[PDB]
């Protein structure tokens, strides 16, 4: 309490700072504006003079510079924190309830949020960038109108680190679920092994045939499955869990899995159980399974069962049964409570130390692509799909750009604004023609969907109505075109407008919580236009360049600033003194005034005699 | 010296050492050698318990950690871990806190490092601690190592590594030229016999501090030392009175009754400013010369009105000075005109001392100071009137006050700065919740009240602490942003503070506040008892039959505020945080049962109905928006009406709510003393209107839920 | 149609919306509960609950004393301060039996800290009574004055710097017949009785603050009590938030799941309001002597000095009273030193009755209060007693079909009782009530309720079907601490982070706290973002910086740059958070060691860190 008020009041005076006397003979006696940067008074009880924080800012902005040495080496503690945070990743958050400085994120009131910090380890820049880009593209395309064509458009309309991603895809042998799905959609060759349950399944012995079986679940729900009959030998490959599995006709006989931690081993074991197509787990199904992705589209029953088991499997472990175990070198058991045991283990699931690892394969196959990106090989088994794509997201060692129409809402609201205006400026000719001819379709363009999110819901229909009326006036008046205004104001009209009487002098866009304001007339921090250089700046980030179209009024009048009114340029003292925007509601048709639009400039305006209508 | 330890030792070990010494309350700056000693001890313990694991068969494998650290944690965690280990393995409970625990050997090991010879340290440690089945690991910087029974759990490689670490550390101290101090600081902690004798006064006091039937402390010590329980509790309970018992009253649905409300004259407004009846003289967009200064803004806002009349009193202050309020209002207007006549107007203008100003403030009505010796012989000299205020009946105007406080305004009252981007999904959920709530409540009247109070209180405090002996004038300004997006500046009235020579935080400054309004105070005069009402103009308002003229009233009232109350009113922004916390807690409570982030369907769904009111046809629901606005309004009302009565009633009624809840879930509840709880709750319903309305809400909820 | 927030509970279970019922969530502005009449009523009630206790006259302070221990057993449900020594000792013995060695380990692990603490440890703490000046004073200045006076009086052993040495110095000074106080030159001679009464004072602006001669002994006894509690499971101290949340769930799981389906379980939540009336320092001394059985005598004396001294505690009486005459419009104030002999016509009926009750105790303007305790000095010992009472509820001790357990933290208590039938539950609750009454533990029947197991609360940790709703903390100040730009930023961001970690602060609420933080910081230091249109003198040069920098995000918030903090990134220092983004020239200028401005919290030694004039 006391310190805050004391500092607030102390900073008020002109010279609240105390500094050594040397500053007298090192910095100018005042500023370029003649402001004094010090005072001759000496601190009580010492020889230090009194100066002002303006001197602090002067030193910060144009003070003498020195070499930055001993700083990176001395601060060895917080730098590692920065590296771990930035190079770390994240994951799905579950509402149920290295790791010594992230406590708030990992644990909360009643939810858990996974996080794996970084450091300087792991794979290279190109592979990680490709994996993350493919993950984002696939995840967004999951919810598109048609994932296949949309995904192709995103892949062909994006690049990685200044290099088109198609070249990397064709010249990079990196393997990943998202990358493999993108390659399959592109029609190239993908790995024979099929990514299921988050791990790569590679067959290396045995075979089976597909049969359609109807099975009654433990919850009294009948599901149709494509059960495989015949001995098969699979290897589950994963970074933190590698396993070797045998399967037979509706029977699991052996599974040896090695993982760094118990969680990965448990995940691999659950994946093996679900892949085994055992009747016992069918009888162990509880509840109604309707798992869907962000697109709410129903998935195949196997994926739903896998998700249900991943949610929890405590009620299933004890149902398998009890069998004996033999003590062997490099052999570990699996208790029902998920704990290794020397004397006992869970049925048909063992744990080894080294496991099956090391050598990989370089085999590729020709595959076909179905409606919703579900990659299926010639045999019939599902190879890949977005349902099996991991949720991990990290950082990009090199800049990655996404010019598509649905990747904009990734870099942030500022990025959304900048990219919407970039799209508007890049398509200036076509957008102008559409606005002139059939603007109704333009106002329904999906490319403006992100902007509708930034504009508050409570004040988006009224904003849209104001914009529609203003643009109708601009169209029906003629002779007063102004491209900058059109680009600035177009995106706000997307909503289904409604009639209103407000005369908006500024519209609000929510960026990073704080709401910025863009003025209908003149320049705004959100939208700046420099006519001296003819450049548009959006929040300090360039958005493109504007070229004046074959319509313009270079002699005053501007009809798209005040609804129902036409501004006639410079003010005239002869007419009625400066009015108020609210008062303008009483002027008669054709009346003129000297309204004060804003800032410190007066503009003469005449009330439109006609009336511009909208749908 | 500590710089070397900080730079060499890894951050985690130094952080653990800092926490450990903070637990014992020892400052590292004063004690330097012990800092290095503790850091080395922790380092050697961790190395002893590093890169060691136990395989699933039982054999020792080097890559379930073989060694578990017990001294690397705090006392509570270490004690819990050792208790659990002993209970599970049935091992003899250690006397002290061991440094490490070996799982393969299932035994507790202690680590010791000394500057002097190892043998003396081992001997003293064994004599002090070792009594049965205990092992100590002893090392030193001299390169000589030994342990108990010549048994080392660590292999040759680990022992050599620890020896090399100690040797390189010793070489570092030798190079730095401070190893001599390190060695000399060690002395073995000579444990000379400690004597603490109670004698003289303390012996008498101790002898006079024993239970009955005891003559001296020594007799009691001997008695307790030889004490062994034998059925004393059972005997006392058998001989205890049967009437003593905590009986459970069967709590059914019919038992509860509504709280008995007090009877008497209706309540009255006591807020620092009007809430439902405030009036604003506003400028849509301040672009005039000299912006930012509250005085110029107030002058400009005043110039927008031309309906001034000759002031006259409609509803007078019954127990107060009516004419002087009028005189001081006239003085305010004349002083403003005089300021208008000036050219070089300073930042603020102090009103000249006048009779009416002093009388309205209360300076001339303030009792003087004199010692009790010179005023004892006074016929009516009594203790301050610490008498319980008279009961006041519930009045409907507070209900309307809250109703209008919960309505939706048409301006952006609160402006908040920016933060970083959100990358984690939990960050996305948090941003979504915050943005939804903010969009909901940013247009509520509660935010208007918050900003008005903050501005008034900050200006008043700055004026009070700026000029001590000046009766300054302070406009009541509030800056907002309309829906259209124009910076509106509203002026509600004026305040004049008294003398502000403040030395204590609780010192009371007296001010006189004049507030505009358009409510006729002859409709509910009882609501207005502390105010003097003047009619200082007429306003033209547009209605379906043109511009009708209605009177413009002014409420003048003398109030007092303390610096701590000023800060409390300057920190009302926390009402938004509290209201969020409430809605977020409800979100989490409803989500946990369903086990999924439910904010998306909580806010956007617009299919939920939370009972938030009542109507003639029955109860009424609303939206999550209505819920958020109601909670924020309740928080602001609680902040403005801060009184012990409110907290008392809330605390005593929360228990009744909980018991009713338990009744709803068929938990078969019971009450030991229901009437006592009822009396405790009703003790807080005497005169306050806010608490009375809360009690009325509680009675409505009681009569509705049990149906 | 008319707002009614309470009606929310008509569909939402109350436990979910409990925050609705916390009106303040802060420090109110009135400070109701401190004065003189409150002390009068406290003393009167303390001596009333010991009505039948034996009366005696003290020999050193020359004041009466009341001893209710072993008095007649209560016959009515009203509060009783008749705590039996034998029952307390039996309860402690049973606690030791169920937890063997606990007292032994506590003693042997605390002897070192008893022999290790330095004198400066007493500097940390709350306000202290300065016998030299006879008024509440900061601990540090009180210590300085005490050492100065003792040095003047030839008691300089405390110069060794050991806390035990200073305690011995205090013992010697108290043994002296009289001492001198030199204030600045005014000399005051305090006799043996005067000094003794001063040293046993309890000032009242932890409502009560003892003097300085009793700080170290209180600290030692509280350290032992904390050490004993640590080994105790039912004890609610000194754990934090997560462990406290887990305690309720663990207790419920233990009591319910293990129980048979036939058995019925119930839970009672109770508040031990006015918890210090019925607990006497003599019973605490008895339990302390029992704890240190077969231990070195010096340690026993050091540990037993505290309750011995407190049993003769003297309570000060507020600042006084204020009288006013409306007829003559006059105001006057009278001190408490003149309250012993003064007319009772000035006061009202209740106040004059209280004065009549407390008249025969005021010694030298300071009442004598042997029985009862004062808030917030021996809380851990009270928790120890409560956990002993709880431990006396096992199936082996009860020797009955029913049984019980629960938690106690000395301010709230919860008890789960289960039995084969409803009559069994009634018998269990009644037996617990009587047993806790015998020891002097008082359960308020007007603020306690019983319901089927699953839903209850403890220390505001409301529990419903495995869900805890911790509401035991208030929101701190998110403002400028007033040191410097980097210092304030670092301390405040660390504050919000720490509150998030433990105090159970929601993420969105943390985000708004950071928002208000940025607002207040920019307003106070006048360092606004370059893009913003706000105007001030500092905005001029600041503006220049905004133009010069090639990376806006690199600039520090104090320098006008954007605030990139968020939930994910809060622990990192602000300077380190923008290290790479900062332009090379800006980095060199900012952290120049040769700057003229420079001759806990985690921050970098930038030029923004200066000492205010």
Residue numbers in the entry:
A (entry chain F): 41 to 137, 227 to 744
B (entry chain D): 1 to 63, 73 to 716
C (entry chain E): 1 to 184, 207 to 227, 240 to 633, 656 to 669
Sentences from the paper on this structure:
In the nucleus of the infected cell, influenza polymerase (FluPol) uses the viral genomic RNA (vRNA) as template to perform synthesis of either capped and polyadenylated viral mRNA (transcription), or unmodified anti-genomic copies (complementary or cRNA), which then serve as the template for vRNA synthesis (replication). ANP32 is required for both vRNA to cRNA and cRNA to vRNA replication. ANP32 comprises a folded, N-terminal leucine-rich repeat (LRR) domain followed by a Glu-, Asp-rich intrinsically disordered region known as the low complexity acidic region (LCAR). First, it stabilises the formation of the replication complex, an asymmetric FluPol dimer comprising a replicase, which is part of a parental RNP and synthesises the genome copy and an encapsidase, a newly synthesised apo-FluPol, which binds the 5’ end of the nascent RNA replicate to nucleate formation of a progeny RNP.
Focussed refinement on the separate replicase and hANP32A-encapsidase moieties further improved map quality to 3.21 and 3.13 Å resolution, respectively, allowing a relatively complete model to be built, with the replicase core being similar to that in the CORE-ENDO(R)-1 structure. The PB2-627(R) domain behaves as a rigid-body part of the encapsidase in focussed cryo-EM refinement, which is explained by its interfaces with PB2-NLS(E) and PA-C(E) domains. In the distinct encapsidase conformation, the PA-ENDO(E) packs on the PB1(E) fingers domain, but has only low-resolution density. The flexible PA-ENDO(E) 51-72 insertion contacts the top of the PB2-CBD(E) (e.g. residues PA/55-57 with PB2/I461, 469-471, K482), which is not rigidly integrated into the FluA replication complex either. The PB2(E) midlink domain is stabilised in position by residues 520-524 forming an antiparallel alignment of strands with PB2-N(E) residues 126-132. PB2-N(E) residues 138-226, which include the helical lid domain, are not visible in the map, having apparently been displaced to avoid clashing with the PA-ENDO(E). The PB2/627-NLS(E) double domain is in the closed conformation with the 627-domain packing against PA-C(E). The C-terminal end of the LRR domain, notably the 128-129 loop, packs against the PA-C(E) domain, burying the N-terminus of PB1(E) and the peptide 152-157 curves back against the LRR domain to contact the PB2/627-NLS(E) double domain. Finally, hANP32A/K153 also makes interactions with PB2(E)/N711 and PA(E)/E493, which are stabilised by PA(E)/R495 and E293 in a network of polar interactions. Another major point of contact is of the PA-C(E) 550-loop, which bends to be able to interact with the concave β-sheet surface of hANP32A.
